[model samples]
Target: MEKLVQPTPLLLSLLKSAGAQKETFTMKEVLYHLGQYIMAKQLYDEKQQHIVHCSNDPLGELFGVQEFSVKEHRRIYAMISRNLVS
Candidate 1:
């Protein structure tokens, strides 16, 4: 797995507007903050997961939103490379 990076100022602002109450939050919280629709499972196991999982959503499409999953993450990135000429 790739190492996770800390959130930049833009992310902090989004979370704050999203109704985040503290420094620490879940992927669901960040998504909710961005007005994205999230699933119940996404909010589950909060302690095991963290903000890293939240990084992929909105940023992934630069459009609307969807649930995040390793399979889906790979699928999204794969689409970007699907048309590679090489």
Candidate 2:
């Protein structure tokens, strides 16, 4: 079986926040959750200027930017892979 990675506290909550009840998730699964959460919350951005307003505090710390756009999420992509395997 492919090794399943456990989510860190922040990642765990993010998954939960998106209604993913499973304990383990693939990298794609995480992205699915992110997109689902963003869509569901209608939290695409703030200031009406395309700033993906890292709405959830969980994401704020994970992405490390309280004020950033969907593109910023990609920039923080580096952070995801690093902390994901925990």
Candidate 3:
């Protein structure tokens, strides 16, 4: 039988931060915030952009989680941002 695993520090931190806000949000929003956090921490440059499809086991382990991945609770793609200030 497979052993149970827990969430990683990064995952826990993200969830904790979100949970603290006490705001209801869709999974996509969670993904978006997580992605933003990844970018903020300068982990990997690109993976954060993909959100769902980018969840991988290696990253999970790196963060202290053995077997974990963010569920693909919704379908969404990266969007190109246009310059607003310019």
Candidate 4:
């Protein structure tokens, strides 16, 4: 595994805007989850599971928000990757 580097300033700003806590552990935890989604389940487990798990109707029921589908999750994952990769 590559050694995890600290977040760049731009990365920090993006994460903050996306509602991530200003803490290294939080950032690491999120990355760990993403890795699990990709490696273990072979699925993205980001906002879809979140909004659904929380029972947020508006966010959960949005069009194209299906979580169990790989295609849909990959689409969302791409968006998130672009947003955070600056």
lDDT of each: 0.41, 0.68, 0.39, 0.40
Per-residue lDDT tens digits of candidate 4, residues 1-84? 443334445444434444556434343554544334343332334655432221232222322344434345566444334434
Lowest summed lDDT window (length 10), candidate 2: 46-55
* Reference-based lDDT, residue 49, model 3: 42
- Candidate 1, residue 21: how far the Cα is off, in Å: 1.8
Better of 2 and 3 by TM-score: 2
Q: Name the runs in model 1 displaced over 4 angstroms.
A: 1-6, 36-86
- Candidate closest to the true structure, highest lDDT: 2
Clashing pairs in 2: 52-69
TM-score of each: 0.32, 0.67, 0.34, 0.27
TM-score of 1: 0.32
In candidate 2, position 11 carries an lDDT of 72
| lDDT, candidate 3, 25-80, per-residue tens | 34455456656655555445355543423244333433433322234322222110
Report clashes for each candidate as comma-separated counts: 1, 1, 0, 0
Clashes of 2: 1
How does candidate 4 score on lDDT?
0.40
Over 8-77, each residue of candidate 2 has an lDDT whose tens digit, in order, gives 7787787788899987777677777877776766667545645666646567777676666656566656
Candidate 1 per-residue lDDT, tens place, 1-86, comes to 43222334545545555555565444444445544322332432265443224435543343233334433555534432332222
Give residue 78's lDDT in candidate 1 (0 to 100).
Answer: 47
